Subunit: 258 residues, 3 copies
Amino acid sequence: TTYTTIATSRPVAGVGLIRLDRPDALNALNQTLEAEVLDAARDFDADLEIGAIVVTGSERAFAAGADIAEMVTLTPHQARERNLLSGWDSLTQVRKPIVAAVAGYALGGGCELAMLCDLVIAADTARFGQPEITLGILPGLGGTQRLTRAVGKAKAMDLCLTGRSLTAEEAERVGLVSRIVPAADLLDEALAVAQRIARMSRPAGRAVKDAINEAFERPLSAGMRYERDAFYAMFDTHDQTEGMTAFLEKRTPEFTDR
Amino acid sequence: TTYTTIATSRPVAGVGLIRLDRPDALNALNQTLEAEVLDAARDFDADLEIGAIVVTGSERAFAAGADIAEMVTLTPHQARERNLLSGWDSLTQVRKPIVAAVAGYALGGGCELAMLCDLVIAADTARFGQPEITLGILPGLGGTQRLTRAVGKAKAMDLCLTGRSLTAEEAERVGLVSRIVPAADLLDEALAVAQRIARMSRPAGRAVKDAINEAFERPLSAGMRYERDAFYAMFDTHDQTEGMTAFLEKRTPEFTDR
Amino acid sequence: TTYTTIATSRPVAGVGLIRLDRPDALNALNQTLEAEVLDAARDFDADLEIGAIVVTGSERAFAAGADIAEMVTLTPHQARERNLLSGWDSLTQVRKPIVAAVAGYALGGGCELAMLCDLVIAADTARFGQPEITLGILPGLGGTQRLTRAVGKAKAMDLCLTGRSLTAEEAERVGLVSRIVPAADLLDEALAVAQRIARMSRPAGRAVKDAINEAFERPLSAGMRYERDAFYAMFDTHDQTEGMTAFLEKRTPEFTDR
Ligand code: NA
Ligand code: NA
Ligand code: NA
């Protein structure tokens, strides 16, 4: 498939890479980019050879905002009738893990894109913010929901009311990102993390991702019941027997389940 | 209005300041102070010229506890019949943002007051704790609820079972506060943050605050739906058009919505 | 009672210690150990002289995993019919506080054991991970539920998909543990913390623990109502009068409630 706003590749075995490529717009999220990222991610999710997906931007910007030239003329009814941002919501239904590799600006919709991914690997140059209020709006893709759950009320209120950014260091300290690495090492780290995930059991990876997502949907008691049911069900798989037998036999597992 | 336990002022444009002023009691929260803070905050919320509110104590204490001389004689039925602490609950219904500027002791009800605010700016001298257990009670104003949500179970259990305090540094590290600054810079930082918020769109500020509060009331899926509806509705406002147009025209926005 | 996988003691006044003792297995959690820890904890909970419980392993391992030799042959129906891990769930019903004192490896079920406790005191040597995916399974004792609630999605996804460990330092930074101390000081710190808790009001300790646990079961509004009811009820106790009177009289309280 040919894309106009992104570049896709398979840079290492088992990993699909989606690189945002609107450099004139600092990778601002527009409607085309939304559809193209969703399409690419769905193709990677359907590809048996791929175990994990990486989303990244440029050295300068993961994504600096949603595209404001596109949003300025929007009305409430048009936003609702077009189901605006629903493509990004659909991205949360991809079953394989998605690793955001964030360099430079991840602002507004770009911060929200990083937060909707499963892991975030941040360059030391990464800056995370929700400056929607400065434009007379509020976040619409989880900047008030996923951010608050990750970093707490006091930091979420500061970001979303003042427009300030967090540095990568601060973001890691308060739970927004998985890891920080030097900027020159960002893509290598993200590809290595993604390949490690891709070498793991496929059904176990899906189960982990599903269960962590479910942690935000239920009270703890019900989440524990959900996780316990998922755990029992893993014992139905070939990969469970192989993984545990390999451990006990001090050898590498050969996972085969789809 | 004349107050007996607080001092109110408008120190910079767009900002209302509430300073707790019971120095003999280290600003312990009594019934009078509760009613006076609520009254002052409601007046600032109704004042069109004000965009944000700051609550602060003295250099020595934001508030060291609820007033124990007042609580010692309390019975369960009197506490329930008087709706004790309901004024502080009402403070959560103020629509404009509230910034807590915390120096020195914020203990017990004082820590809870900081946590019920939207942002917390802490002096490096700030100390946060919930020593209710040492008095034979437990927190009654969110010291087990807002604290746990901010800092996690292990730190909340430590504070509320052992009576220890967190330093400002520790509090920031685990998500209890928005920012730390040197003690001499605390009021300047809080007033600057509050004025920045007051320069933002009024309906967008209310929407941000409401949506972040809603993050603690719903599972993520339903919170995302709530936030998406709020986002669509912002496109109904003059401030959205002005904010986005100003961005695109590389100029300062002139927000006008009430 | 004689135990085969643990050693129990009363090392300081008011504290019951449970030491995991399967050194050949690095304290891996098997069925026997589960039942023995539950039994010991229930005995300490019923002992009027005990105010807090400490669970610890060896210098090398708090617990390195669930016992894989035992799980390798498990089927989904046998896991469900045996109510596997239900003993650990029952441990959450112990009313007195439980302090995990973690040195060295706390992996898999061992990390989950630390997270199900109320406080975690970590040696600087502590390592926390959920490497279940490497065995073809997922966590079944809260490694996707309690971990996510403590540290956030990005870190929980990293741990549970990549199998990496957090250092004690990292774990404290993101909210997984209460305190870090040098390895040589771990048991002293944990016993001192536990004795401090044991010197507090018994009903107030139970109420604190219950309310913090309830923070994960309800939306904030309902959690605040729960906590407010619990607070009113504390004024029914002798310990509340004694604790507050002692404060006001600048003396040590003599708590007596059971
Ligand atoms: Na099996
Ligand atoms: Na519009
Ligand atoms: Na009483």
